[PDB]
Amino acid sequence: NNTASIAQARKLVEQLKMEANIDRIKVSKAAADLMAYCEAHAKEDPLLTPVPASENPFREKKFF
Amino acid sequence: ASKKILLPEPSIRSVMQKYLEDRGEVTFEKIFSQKLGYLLFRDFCLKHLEEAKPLVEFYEEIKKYEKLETEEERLVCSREIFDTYIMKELLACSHPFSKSAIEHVQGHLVKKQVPPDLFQPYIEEICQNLRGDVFQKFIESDKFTRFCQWKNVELNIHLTMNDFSVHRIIGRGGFGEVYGCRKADTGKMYAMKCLDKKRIKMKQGETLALNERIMLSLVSTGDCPFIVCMSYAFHTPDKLSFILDLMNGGDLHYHLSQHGVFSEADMRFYAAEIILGLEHMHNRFVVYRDLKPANILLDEHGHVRISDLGLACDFSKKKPHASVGTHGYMAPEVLQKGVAYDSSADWFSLGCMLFKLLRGHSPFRQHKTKDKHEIDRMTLTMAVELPDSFSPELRSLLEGLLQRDVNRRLGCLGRGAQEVKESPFFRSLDWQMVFLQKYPPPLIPPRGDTKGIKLLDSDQELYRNFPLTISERWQQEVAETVFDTINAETDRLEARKKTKNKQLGHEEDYALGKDCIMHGYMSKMGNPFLTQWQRRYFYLFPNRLEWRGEGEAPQSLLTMEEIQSVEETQIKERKCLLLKIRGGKQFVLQCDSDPELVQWKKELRDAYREAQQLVQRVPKMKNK
Amino acid sequence: SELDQLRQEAEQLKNQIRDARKACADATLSQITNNIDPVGRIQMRTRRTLRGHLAKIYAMHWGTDSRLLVSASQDGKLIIWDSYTTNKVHAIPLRSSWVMTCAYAPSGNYVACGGLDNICSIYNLKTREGNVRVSRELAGHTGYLSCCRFLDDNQIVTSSGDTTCALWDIETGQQTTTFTGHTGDVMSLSLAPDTRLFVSGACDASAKLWDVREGMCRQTFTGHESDINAICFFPNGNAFATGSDDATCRLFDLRADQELMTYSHDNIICGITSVSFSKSGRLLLAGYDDFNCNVWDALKADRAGVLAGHDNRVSCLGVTDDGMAVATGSWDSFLKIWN
Amino acid sequence: RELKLLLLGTGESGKSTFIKQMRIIHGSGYSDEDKRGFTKLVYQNIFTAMQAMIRAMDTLKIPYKYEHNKAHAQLVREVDVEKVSAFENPYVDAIKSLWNDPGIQECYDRRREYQLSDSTKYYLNDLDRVADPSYLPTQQDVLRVRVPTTGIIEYPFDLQSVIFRMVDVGGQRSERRKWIHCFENVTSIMFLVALSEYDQVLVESDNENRMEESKALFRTIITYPWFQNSSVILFLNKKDLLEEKIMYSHLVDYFPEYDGPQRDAQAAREFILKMFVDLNPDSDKIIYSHFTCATDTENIRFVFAAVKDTILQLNLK
Numbered sequence A: 001n002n003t004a005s006i007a008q009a010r011k012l013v014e015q016l017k018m019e020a021n022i023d024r025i026k027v028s029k030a031a032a033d034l035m036a037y038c039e040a041h042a043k044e045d046p047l048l049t050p051v052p053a054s055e056n057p058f059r060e061k062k063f064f
Numbered sequence B: 001a002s003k004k005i006l007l008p009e010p011s012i013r014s015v016m017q018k019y020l021e022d023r024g025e026v027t028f029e030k031i032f033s034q035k036l037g038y039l040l041f042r043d044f045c046l047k048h049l050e051e052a053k054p055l056v057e058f059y060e061e062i063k064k065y066e067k068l069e070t071e072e073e074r075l076v077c078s079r080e081i082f083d084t085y086i087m088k089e090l091l092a093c094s095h096p097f098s099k100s101a102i103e104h105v106q107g108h109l110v111k112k113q114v115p116p117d118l119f120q121p122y123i124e125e126i127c128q129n130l131r132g133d134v135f136q137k138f139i140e141s142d143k144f145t146r147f148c149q150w151k152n153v154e155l156n157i158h159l160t161m162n163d164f165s166v167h168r169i170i171g172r173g174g175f176g177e178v179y180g181c182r183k184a185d186t187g188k189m190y191a192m193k194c195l196d197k198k199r200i201k202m203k204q205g206e207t208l209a210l211n212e213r214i215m216l217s218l219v220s221t222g223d224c225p226f227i228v229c230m231s232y233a234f235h236t237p238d239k240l241s242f243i244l245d246l247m248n249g250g251d252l253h254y255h256l257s258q259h260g261v262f263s264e265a266d267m268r269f270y271a272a273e274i275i276l277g278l279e280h281m282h283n284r285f286v287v288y289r290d291l292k293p294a295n296i297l298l299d300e301h302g303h304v305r306i307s308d309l310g311l312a313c314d315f316s317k318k319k320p321h322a323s324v325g326t327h328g329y330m331a332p333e334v335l336q337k338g339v340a341y342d343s344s345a346d347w348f349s350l351g352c353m354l355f356k357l358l359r360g361h362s363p364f365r366q367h368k369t370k371d372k373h374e375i376d377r378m379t380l381t382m383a384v385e386l387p388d389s390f391s392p393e394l395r396s397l398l399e400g401l402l403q404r405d406v407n408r409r410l411g412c413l414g415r416g417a418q419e420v421k422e423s424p425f426f427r428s429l430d431w432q433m434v435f436l437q438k439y440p441p442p443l444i445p446p447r448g449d450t451k452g453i454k455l456l457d458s459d460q461e462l463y464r465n466f467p468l469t470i471s472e473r474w475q476q477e478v479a480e481t482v483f484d485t486i487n488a489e490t491d492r493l494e495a496r497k498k499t500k501n502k503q504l505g506h507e508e509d510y511a512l513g514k515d516c517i518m519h520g521y522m523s524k525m526g527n528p529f530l531t532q533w534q535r536r537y538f539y540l541f542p543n544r545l546e547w548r549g550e551g552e553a554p555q556s557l558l559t560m561e562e563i564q565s566v567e568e569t570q571i572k573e574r575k576c577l578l579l580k581i582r583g584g585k586q587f588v589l590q591c592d593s594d595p596e597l598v599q600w601k602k603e604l605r606d607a608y609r610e611a612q613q614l615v616q617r618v619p620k621m622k623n624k
Numbered sequence C: 001s002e003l004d005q006l007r008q009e010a011e012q013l014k015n016q017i018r019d020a021r022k023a024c025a026d027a028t029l030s031q032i033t034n035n036i037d038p039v040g041r042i043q044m045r046t047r048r049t050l051r052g053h054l055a056k057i058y059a060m061h062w063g064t065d066s067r068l069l070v071s072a073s074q075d076g077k078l079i080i081w082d083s084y085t086t087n088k089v090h091a092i093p094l095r096s097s098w099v100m101t102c103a104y105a106p107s108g109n110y111v112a113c114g115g116l117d118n119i120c121s122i123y124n125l126k127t128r129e130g131n132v133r134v135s136r137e138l139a140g141h142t143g144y145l146s147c148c149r150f151l152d153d154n155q156i157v158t159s160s161g162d163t164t165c166a167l168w169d170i171e172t173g174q175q176t177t178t179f180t181g182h183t184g185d186v187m188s189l190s191l192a193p194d195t196r197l198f199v200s201g202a203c204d205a206s207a208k209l210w211d212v213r214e215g216m217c218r219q220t221f222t223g224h225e226s227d228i229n230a231i232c233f234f235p236n237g238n239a240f241a242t243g244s245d246d247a248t249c250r251l252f253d254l255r256a257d258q259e260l261m262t263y264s265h266d267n268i269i270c271g272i273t274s275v276s277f278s279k280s281g282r283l284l285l286a287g288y289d290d291f292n293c294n295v296w297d298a299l300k301a302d303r304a305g306v307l308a309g310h311d312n313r314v315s316c317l318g319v320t321d322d323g324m325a326v327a328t329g330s331w332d333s334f335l336k337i338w339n
Numbered sequence D: 001r002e003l004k005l006l007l008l009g010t011g012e013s014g015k016s017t018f019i020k021q022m023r024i025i026h027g028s029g030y031s032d033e034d035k036r037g038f039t040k041l042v043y044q045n046i047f048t049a050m051q052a053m054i055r056a057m058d059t060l061k062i063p064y065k066y067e068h069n070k071a072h073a074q075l076v077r078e079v080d081v082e083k084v085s086a087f088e089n090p091y092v093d094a095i096k097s098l099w100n101d102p103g104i105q106e107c108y109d110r111r112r113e114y115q116l117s118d119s120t121k122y123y124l125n126d127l128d129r130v131a132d133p134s135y136l137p138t139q140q141d142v143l144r145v146r147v148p149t150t151g152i153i154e155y156p157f158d159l160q161s162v163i164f165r166m167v168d169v170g171g172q173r174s175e176r177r178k179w180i181h182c183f184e185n186v187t188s189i190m191f192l193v194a195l196s197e198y199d200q201v202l203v204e205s206d207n208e209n210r211m212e213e214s215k216a217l218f219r220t221i222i223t224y225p226w227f228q229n230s231s232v233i234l235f236l237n238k239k240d241l242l243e244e245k246i247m248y249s250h251l252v253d254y255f256p257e258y259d260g261p262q263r264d265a266q267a268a269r270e271f272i273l274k275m276f277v278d279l280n281p282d283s284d285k286i287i288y289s290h291f292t293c294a295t296d297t298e299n300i301r302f303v304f305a306a307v308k309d310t311i312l313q314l315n316l317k
């Protein structure tokens, strides 16, 4: 029962070769990028900043 | 027929089809054999199917052929059957039967011989054709639905005495009287051998009461003209009932004492009908043992049947040896203490009676001595001296029937009754005319306290597996009375609600196209101090038990997850289901019939166990 | 020899990956975000309640219109609600009672679902005859269908309990690509805005970034001490959050190929059932198995609020494409819309 | 004194032709008034035949050598079977030309693959006589006409010795249904078999072999219990057609147990005959066989002279 274990262990190492062969980014820049996304779209997000009840479909109106 | 046999709605089919399939009852041989199945099956073939029709008709015409009496009739008939069903189709090559079967019939008809089983090979091959697709198409049809309705009624038979009108009092017995009654359901007349349970233990006779029930059960199946057969057995708390065939003509000892002795030609009649009665019990490996004039009863017309089966005995497994029965008619081996015997003993008993019918006393008691050791000694020792008046035909018969040796006894040598029937005595008789009761009887009869003893639960346990119904009987009784007329009635009431529910809003398509396993009406509760009983239509799905009322889809259900246990609990002495739900909460169900209750018990248990097994290996659905 | 040299190569190549990641780890997100102003307290209110399901709700999914939504439930039904009006646009009964997932198409025409039937049943709302007719039986999976998401009207990705995912062509009813790799039942998945990548969460306590195009696993993230029950993409498509039976959520960045943040507390002991981001990504909404549904500051990792509107486990939840509302399905038979 | 005789057999086997011969020899011979009666039916046979042949060329995909005759083929195709008044010019030359086309001849030589008729070559080779204004059909023409019998008919002929009440019937499977109702007091059975059937399939069922149908039908009639008393007379008809067919179509092919030399009428005759004789359940019974041609009065005279004598030798004594 070597042919299964070996065929499996090769996929693993061919996979690990896949995963290790990427150009990673410094975590600090990863964060800065995400932080700066929210900073841009914080206005366009009604869950974050409460919108006018008039603009809210789940309050102002029963006709839609 | 005053009491209306109520017929369950066709929604019952979902439960029944599962109830019957679980027992492998939904096969052609199982259903076609039952009378009400045949009747529904044959209606389907004739009315609906195209190529089924001529096969049933063949089967029909053959069945009529079988019951033809004279050969001159059967000779005429065998041709028309052949010419119409065999030759006409065979010429055109649309005859779907074997060359063997065809050749078998030609082989006979060419030789001009017409056995009543001539077409028997064709009968078998008509099944093969009806057993395949044709049977499946029937199962798919409304006629199988109707069979389920009728079968539900059968399987939910519970008999109190309110089901019987009691017309007269026709007997007294060892442990209770015997009435003559009418079952209100169908109007069929029966005799109710009713027994007091207290008197039983007072005379320590629980054995011969229960033996009678087992013996009557073995005998009652297979339609028999010459035995007082059972249709139903039941009990009330103190009374024990058998519903037997109605013998309003009294017994043969009374009619002997009244009439005096009988002629040789008159006795021949009785003997022949008693012989076919004994033949029936012997073909089911039962011995009667109590064969004597008092145990022969006459019907209205003067025909006969064998009665008190209490002292009877099953010898298929092991043979008895004790001396049971009236010791004026018992055989040598029965008397011989610890000597084994079987059917042979009945033929010795017959001879003693047939002699007593001609002489007025048993062939052993001299001067009616009433002495056990005298009579029984003469049985073992002395041979009968048959009066010179006894013809040689009868001489031959009673010398054969009354051998002490069983190796020389007539009826015991190998072929049973057929030996006795061959005897030169019965040489005049067409033995099937005997069976068909076509011979005219010699005698038409005319029209005319220690109860303080205690009754234990131990005694009541004895009669727990007592109550019984015999399908053949009940179905026939129904077939010959209400069947067609109830069908006619139900056909309307269902068609009436088909038009009604069409025009209100299209119903009964909720269970369709989903994985619903079984659906039907039941009744639900919760606990005693708040809720009450409500009738709803349930749907069992693999993971939930939905239920609704009319005019809606289900608005409440019960998950298989939350069902802990299904248990049979009785509520006011009535079998019910107890569903214990996760949150210490209870929930009880109740069904119309026994078949339903049983199937809802099985299917819920199966369903919730299978759900909980399955859910518990799925991470989303499982608790933690 | 051949298998032991390959086993020791695996465990060196493995440590090459840990060092490539530790190299990026110069600062944490908790450090970086100290300065930004806190999100405050997200006092959320139950705007709607969606009464209809007869038993546990296992899944739900918004339409792209931010108004319609499907929901699959233990009652064997797949209901489409008009969140604005509470009225049911469709109440579809299923062939299998064992449904576990559902997925509104972005097209709005189709909805999909599946479960222990091991099939992804696709339904058509806009039929020839206007009925609710079944378009396809996508069979092929050898384990329970755990989740699935439409790419378009004719393509759909599905995860299963056979430890694989699969892309289907609805026309051919055939698995275009098969995404094998996981060593546990795949509980969840999530399409990136660019339909060319998707992540998946499994019981092997790991998530994996897949290439839809090609069919390979690009990266594998670990760190959870238990099953990953739910996973979804951050708005931009460079990160994703995971909910786990280890009572924590976590954020993962793809380009930094490691964990950025943990969302958990000593008080929270039961698992996460579901997750979703608000339109901007500042809020991470986690569903729980204590009938609660906590709102996290995705950057600060502080618990901003709680949605406590259900009597049983909060099984599933979502956010609208216009970010206007949060839906939350539950085991108590109700969905609830929030603002 | 009358005697009931059943002419039984597979379709088109010459049962109705056998009757027409009895009328020529014994009964009221064919008057010139009666001979006119068939004129219309003659024309219809020529159309029905030709049409059946035209269709068969399109089925078998056989090319017309002269493409001119495609115009005549459409002309004939639309002609109604029953609406034939007379055989007039627009169709006469067209049908003769069609017949003379070597593509039609290839189709005719493949007559085994589709149902044609047995007198087509007889009539089509003689279209000149048929198209004449005062064309009076001969006694042969009358024997050659195809008039599908349906249902039992009684034709009682009487020689100066005895009355023979002969029963003509239909041969096709549907017609065999009606047979039962005159199986009563049958003196003798005249079973007809077409010898040229060997390489043909049934019209009632294009799957099955005609010779083999007769083979079964004979066995059915023989084994019938109430014919145990009756006499059996086998008539292997169409001897003259077997004499043509066996030159190109081998009997060895359709009945593998045949040892004899192919292209021999006499060797085939005897084998075919034995097949039917071996279907007798008991050789205690004797089957009286004759090779015959129902369109040949000179053959039927000689045969029926011997057959009559056999019937009376057996049934008087």
Ligand SMILES: Nc1nc2c(ncn2[C@@H]2O[C@H](COP(=O)(O)OP(=O)(O)O)[C@@H](O)[C@H]2O)c(=O)[nH]1
Pocket: D009, D010, D011, D012, D013, D014, D015, D016, D017, D018, D118, D119, D143, D144, D145, D146, D147, D148, D149, D170, D171, D237, D238, D239, D240, D241, D292, D293, D294, D295
């Ligand atoms: N050449 C030839 N033609 C025959 C013979 N027997 C019958 N035919 C023709 O074939 C056709 C069929 O014969 P017919 O008596 O009508 O058939 P049946 O009554 O159904 O058995 C008729 O047109 C006959 O003229 C034969 O022995 N030789």
Ligand code: ALF
Pocket: D009, D010, D011, D012, D013, D015, D016, D147, D148, D149, D150, D169, D170, D171, D172
């Ligand atoms: F046997 Al026929 F016309 F075919 F009489």
Ligand SMILES: [Mg+2]
Pocket: D015, D016, D017, D147, D148, D149, D150, D168, D169, D170, D171
């Ligand atoms: Mg004819």
